[PDB]
Amino acid sequence: GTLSALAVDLGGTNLRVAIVSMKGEIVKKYTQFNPKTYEERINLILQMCVEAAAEAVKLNCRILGVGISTGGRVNPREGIVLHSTKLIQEWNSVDLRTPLSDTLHLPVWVDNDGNCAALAERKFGQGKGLENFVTLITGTGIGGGIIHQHELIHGSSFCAAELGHLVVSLDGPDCSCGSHGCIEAYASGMALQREAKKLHDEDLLLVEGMSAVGALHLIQAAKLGNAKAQSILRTAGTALGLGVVNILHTMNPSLVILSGVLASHYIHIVKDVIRQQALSSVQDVDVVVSDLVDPALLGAASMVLDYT
Template sequence: MEYSIGIDIGGTKIATGIVGQQGNVRYKRIHPTPNSTNREIVDLLKQTVSEYMKLATEENINLVSVGIGSAGQIDYKNGRILSGTVNIKDWNNIDIRESLSHTTNLPIYLDNDANTFAIAEHQLGSGKGVDDLVCLTLGTGIGGGIVSDGNVIRGKWGGAAELGHMSVNFNGPDCNCGSKGCIETYASGTGIANRMREKLNSIDAGKRISYTEHPDMLTSKEVFEWNKTGLPEAKEVIDQAITALSFGIVNMIHTFNPSLIIFGGGLAEANRWLIEEVQNKVNAIGMPSLVKGVEMKVSKLGYDTGLIGAAYQVWATSK
C-alpha cells in the first residue's frame, strides 16, 4: 500500500501523520502551533518530515508524497503561502515547497486547509460518490471548499472559495478580511463570541458579572451553553448565526448548484443540531428548484479530515 505524510496546519495546533491511500492514519502527532516566527513552523515541518521518512525506512512503509493543508491564501501551483491568517503569526510569503525540498525528495503538495477537507470528504467521506458539493469548516473562522464536476475549484492561483468571507450584511460588523458583515463575523466561533460580548456590554453591569466576570475570555462554547439554558441574549446571538449561515448557504447553492453541503470543524462537530436548523431555514428562503434536494451532512471523517485530505492530495491529483 502507498502512504503519504500529511500535515494539517491550524491556528492552535499542527496535526501530522502517515496516511494510507484508504484514509487510514498509521501514525499521528499533534503539535502546538509555534507563535513566534514562521521559521519555527518551517523548522517543525522539516523535523517532522525527516522523522517520518526515517520511520518509514525502518518499517518498510512506501511513502509517495508529502501533503500539506494550511490556513491562509495559498498559491497552489507554486507551493507558497501568500498571505496567512491572524491566528498564525508571521504566516506570509513563505515558499513551503522550496523549504522542504532540502529535507525530502518526495513530491510536495500544498493547498488551503478547507480544500484539503473537501478532498478528503469527496474521496473518502460523506461526499464519496458525489461530484458537486460545498464544504464548510466551522471553527475559529469559517473555511470553504467547492467540488464541481469532481474537481476542486481553486481559481487562478488557489484563492477561490473563501466562503466564510461572503458578506450577508453590508452594514454588518467589520471583518478581518477588510469587508463587513461576512458570514464569519456571525457564525464562526470568534464571531459568536464577539456578538455575545456586544450583548453583554449593552446590559446591566450586575447582570453581566453574573454571567461572566471576564467577558474578554468568553468563547462560543459558553454562548452555546447559555443558549441551552434559555438566556435571551445568547439565543439572539445563536439565532443570528443560524440566519447568517443560512443566507450564505443559499447564496452558495444559487451559485454552485451542489447536491450536498458538508460541515466540519469543532463548532459543527459539537453542535450537530445546528445543521437541521440551517437546513430548514435554507429550504424556506432559497429558490425552490435549487435548494430542493440539497442534503446537509456533518463530516464522516471527523477531526482527522484535514490531516487525511492533506495527505491524499497526491492520489486526488493523479485521478
C-alpha cells in the first residue's frame, strides 16, 4: 500500500521527520528541537526515523527510502555534511548515509535544505516544468536553491545557492556565518527576533492591542502602527530585495519563489526593490510566495520519490 518516503529536515531551530506520500501529502509529521550537540542530534534523528518507520507500517505506507534536508554545505553523492555555520553546531564532516542506512535498511539521500526547497518547488510547486528558477527560503536563517536547465546547481565545491550569505552592505549587521551584511543577518527569523528584543528592551515594541518575543511580534506591531518596527521591517525587506536583484543580475531566472513564514510579509517590498533598482530586462521576472506547506521536508521526500 501507499508508496512513501521518509523525510527529515534539520534547521536552525527544529528537527522534523515525516512520512510523505508519492503525491506530496504529509501523512504524519514529528517535531522536536534540533539538539545542540552531535551525539544528541544523530541519536534523535535515528530514534525519530525508527519510530516513523514503525508508524508507517501501522498506517499502511510502504517506505522507499529516506531523504534528508539539512542546513550546511552537503556532498549529496556521498551523503556527507561537509561544513555548517554555527546555526547547527558540531555538524562538519558528518556521514549521514551510513548510520541511517545501517539502522533503517533503506537508501539515503542528503542535500542542503534550500536545495531541497528547490526540488519541492520543481516536483510539487510553482517551479514545475520550468528551465530556471530560484527559491529563497526564510526560516531561522535564509536558504537558497537554484534550478538551471531543470536541475540543481550545486557548484564546484557544493556551495552554490548559499543565498542567505549574499552581501548587500559594506558594513551592516553581523551574521552567524562570521561575515556581516549578509541578507540573512538583516532578514532572517533570527535577525528579526533580535531586532524585536532590541525594541522591547527599550520598551518600544508593544503598542495598543498586543500582549518568547520574536519576528511575528515585530510584524504584528508594525501592522498596528509602530513606526520603528515598520522601519526595521522595511530595512529587512530592502536587504532581501537587493539579494534578489543580485540573483536576477547573476542568473536571470524566470521565477523567484519566496517561502517560509516571512515570505508573505516580504513579497511586496521585494517587488518594489526590483522595480526601483533592477535592470529593465529582468522586470518581467515572476516573484511569488510558495504554495507548499513545508518545501524543505517535501524536497527531502522528492529525492526519494524521484530517484529510488
